[PDB]
Structure formats: structure tokens, C-alpha cells
């Protein structure tokens, strides 16, 4: 088995790569630079992005070398050859793992909001160095060792040359693992726990406003109801109300239910309510523009007065959508809703104005939307490469044998997709838009 031969491609090396490397460099060198002088001199989530943008900067200033390597030759000696591969290893590890810390930061700010102000500080001021940089720096060791200049085809090249396939497969596996899989699992874990907390927050909100009822209750209109405003039956029968509650919870209650059960039932009613909103020309656009906390505000209103009801606030709705909070609050402040149930209204309105739980600690808003976009964007960038190098390592192991046209096509995908990945530098600056 002689190795598969692939041709070098001129247009790729001579036109395509230098083009991309330049665009990225320009939009990168300025974008991160502005982030560093603005955000650097003159919010925890910004702190991490300061780091991130330093990690990307250090990379972009390496691209001119990458480019002249692509077209011509490696003119720059062996120290700079090592430095180029080193920086790269630091960036791609630090860059993703800083995101994980951002995700942990959110987990702490949201799941443990009551008092996690401390551990969030140490994560940002101290741990970040012990858990991101130093370990990034120690992982460059192999680059110092194996990154060397080689003479090949009347020019110089700057490659990592390891001893053998045994080495290569292991580090290529370490690369996948440390590069996506691990930090991915961290991120996804953080995400999962937050959405669980987000929906429990809603539950506590309607607990105050609509009230938690653990025993079957006859409301002012004679309807039988349990939990958080969940109507069981309109019928006169206590025995009918008793008969529904059992069918709803799935056991033989005697007209009482537990805290866990009230909530499971409440979550179902949130689900249905949210599906209604997504299927409503008026409410969908407004709900989509809003954040986690303000969604909760809208969901409250629906629960009280039904979605048609809420869709009637033409004016206030259009302000909410347009993010003009105070004007939304003053309109709603004078409505039939406000007179009939004024304390609930005022809290729900304060929520719409502030985007915090001050009506339920003061002025403490913590946003997710910008972070979620950063991370997803970041992985969208790298994902194709990593699918690429997976398949490449499946070939190395001989899990998939398919001749040279396949092997060579996979190599080609990796080159394209590696180059396109480098756009992850700019995501950070751009997203400040």
C-alpha cells in the first residue's frame, strides 16, 4: 500500500487562500483591535470577551505569514515557524474554552442568582487563568517540539512533523475532544439547566400573581379549579371536578395534590399557551423579539386574559416589539386590566419595563440572547472542519476504505473548511452591532 497522491492546486494556494486570509485579517485586525482599546480601557460577560478578543487578535496578526506561505515560500526562519503553530494551538483551545466559561457564568448568574456574585467573580478574575490560558499554553508543547521548517520542491515549508501515525491519531483525537466534544458538553449542560430554571421562574411568577392552590377550589364564578389557575370543570358537580383532577394527575387524589404535581400541570399549561402564541399573527413577532424574562411577562398576561385578550393591546404591543419599554408601560398603566387587578398589573408592567424580577434585590438584568448567538455562530464556523477531520481519522484507523478519490476529496474539504473556519475571529467584534 503506497500512499495516495494528491495534486497541489495553484488557484487554491495562489488566489483563494490569500484572498480569504486577507479579508479575515482586515476585518479581524481592526474589529478585535477596536474591542481591545474600547472595552479594554474607558459586566462579567464582556470581561470574557476581552480575553476572547485578545486570543483572536494574537491569531490574526499571524495570518500574513500564513498567506505568504500559501503563495510563495516560508521566508521567516524556524522560530517564527514554531510561533505560528503555537499561537494557533493557543487560540483554538482558549477561544472555545473561554466560551464555556461564559456559559458557566450564565449558569451561575441565572440558576444561582440569589448569591453567586462571589464565585462568578473568582471565575472571571482568577480561575480563567488556571483553567483556560495555562492549560492552553501547556498544550503548545508539541508545537515547540515538532513544528519545523523543511525544504521541499525548491521552496521552504513549515509543517508539524511527528514521529509516526501512532502519534498523529492520538493528538488528532485529543484535538477533537478538547476542541469541540468536551467544551460542547460543558456548554450543553449549562444550557439544559438554565431553560429548566427559566420555566420554574415562570411557575413562581404565576404563583404570586394567580396563586397556588393545592386543594380543589370553587372560584367566584362557581368553577372548580386547582393549582395555578387550572380550571377542572364548569359543571356543578364536586364529583366531576374530583373526576377530572384524577384524570389530569393520573392517580387517585382525594382533591389534594402536591407541589411537584401542581408544577408538572402548570408546565403543560405553559406549553399550550406558548404554542398558541407562536400560532398568532399578532403575538408571534412580539414574543420572538423579547427576552427570557419579558416572554414570562407576556405569558402571564395570556394566562390571565387569553391570547386574543392580550393581542388587543395594539399600541403597547407595537412598543414592546420596538423595545420602547417606558412607553409600553405607560399605555398599559391605563387599561381596564389595570383597574380590575392593579397590583398584578403593576408587577407585570415593571417586568416589561426592567426585564428583571424586581417585582418578585434590584436593577440586576442578565441577558442570554447575545451569548447564545456568539456560541452557535462559533460552532457553525468550526463544525464542517471537525466533521472533516473525523472522517479523515476514520480513514486512518481503516474503519472506512474507499480508494484515493475519496481520501483526496476529504483532504480538499478540510482545506476549504479550515480556511473558512478562521472567520471565527470576527464573529466577536461584528456581534457588537
Amino acid at each position: 500500500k503506497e500512499p495516495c497522491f494528491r495534486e497541489e492546486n495553484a488557484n487554491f494556494n495562489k488566489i483563494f487562500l490569500p484572498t480569504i486570509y486577507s479579508i479575515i485579517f482586515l476585518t479581524g485586525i481592526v474589529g478585535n483591535g477596536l474591542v481591545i482599546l474600547v472595552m479594554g480601557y474607558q459586566s462579567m460577560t464582556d470581561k470574557y470577551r476581552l480575553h476572547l478578543s485578545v486570543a483572536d487578535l494574537l491569531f490574526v496578526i499571524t495570518l500574513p505569514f500564513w498567506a505568504v506561505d500559501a503563495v510563495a515560500n516560508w521566508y521567516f526562519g524556524n522560530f517564527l515557524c514554531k510561533a505560528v503553530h503555537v499561537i494557533y494551538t493557543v487560540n483554538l483551545y482558549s477561544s472555545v474554552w473561554i466560551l464555556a466559561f461564559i456559559s458557566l457564568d450564565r449558569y451561575l448568574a441565572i440558576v444561582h442568582a440569589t448569591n453567586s456574585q462571589r464565585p462568578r467573580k473568582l471565575l472571571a478574575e482568577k480561575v480563567v487563568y488556571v483553567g483556560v490560558w495555562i492549560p492552553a499554553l501547556l498544550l503548545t508543547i508539541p508545537d515547540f517540539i515538532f513544528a519545523n521548517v523543511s525544504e521541499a520542491d525548491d521552496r521552504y515549508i513549515c509543517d508539524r512533523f511527528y514521529p509516526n501515525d501512532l502519534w498523529v491519531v492520538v493528538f488528532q483525537f485529543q484535538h477533537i475532544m478538547v476542541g469541540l466534544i468536551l467544551p460542547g458538553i460543558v456548554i450543553l449542560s449549562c444550557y439544559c439547566i438554565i431553560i429548566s430554571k427559566l420555566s420554574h421562574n415562570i411557575f413562581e411568577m404565576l404563583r404570586i400573581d394567580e396563586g397556588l392552590r393545592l386543594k380543589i377550589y370553587k372560584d367566584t364564578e362557581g368553577y372548580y379549579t386547582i393549582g395555578i389557575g387550572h380550571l377542572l370543570t364548569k359543571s356543578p358537580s364536586l364529583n366531576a371536578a374530583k373526576s377530572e383532577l384524577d384524570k389530569a394527575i393520573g392517580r387517585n387524589t382525594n382533591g389534594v395534590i402536591t407541589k411537584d404535581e401542581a408544577e408538572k400541570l402548570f408546565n403543560q399549561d405553559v406549553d399550550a399557551a406558548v404554542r398558541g402564541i407562536l400560532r398568532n399573527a399578532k403575538l408571534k413577532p412580539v414574543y420572538d423579539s423579547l427576552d427570557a424574562v419579558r416572554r414570562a411577562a407576556l405569558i402571564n398576561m395570556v394566562f390571565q386574559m387569553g391570547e386574543t385578550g392580550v393581542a388587543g393591546f395594539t399600541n403597547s404591543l407595537r412598543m414592546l416589539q420596538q423595545k420602547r419599554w417606558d412607553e409600553a408601560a405607560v399605555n398599559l398603566a391605563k387599561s381596564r386590566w389595570y383597574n380590575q387587578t392593579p397590583n398584578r398589573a403593576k408587577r407585570v408592567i415593571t417586568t416589561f419595563r426592567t426585564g428583571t424580577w424586581d417585582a418578585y434585590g434590584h436593577q440586576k438584568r442578565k441577558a442570554l440572547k447575545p451569548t447564545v448567538i456568539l456560541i452557535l455562530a462559533f460552532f457553525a464556523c468550526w463544525l464542517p472542519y471537525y466533521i472533516g477531520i473525523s472522517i479523515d481519522s476514520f480513514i486512518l484507523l481503516e474503519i472506512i476504505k474507499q480508494g484515493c478519490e475519496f481520501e483526496n476529496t476529504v483532504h480538499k474539504w478540510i482545506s476549504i473548511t479550515e480556511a473558512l473556519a478562521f472567520f471565527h475571529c470576527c464573529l466577536n467584534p461584528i456581534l457588537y452591532a
Binding site: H85, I157, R160, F161, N164, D165, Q172, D392, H411
Partner: peptide, 16 residues
């Protein structure tokens, strides 16, 4: 090129 190596008398890289 990041994944080069020695296979017997051959130099290879894994591409990328």
C-alpha cells in the same frame, strides 16, 4: 500543514 508524519520510507500528511 498540521498533521505530517513518517510512514516507513514515506513522509505523509493527514491533510489540513
Amino acid at each position: 500543514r498540521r498533521a505530517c508524519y513518517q510512514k516507513x520510507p514515506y513522509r505523509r500528511c493527514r491533510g489540513x
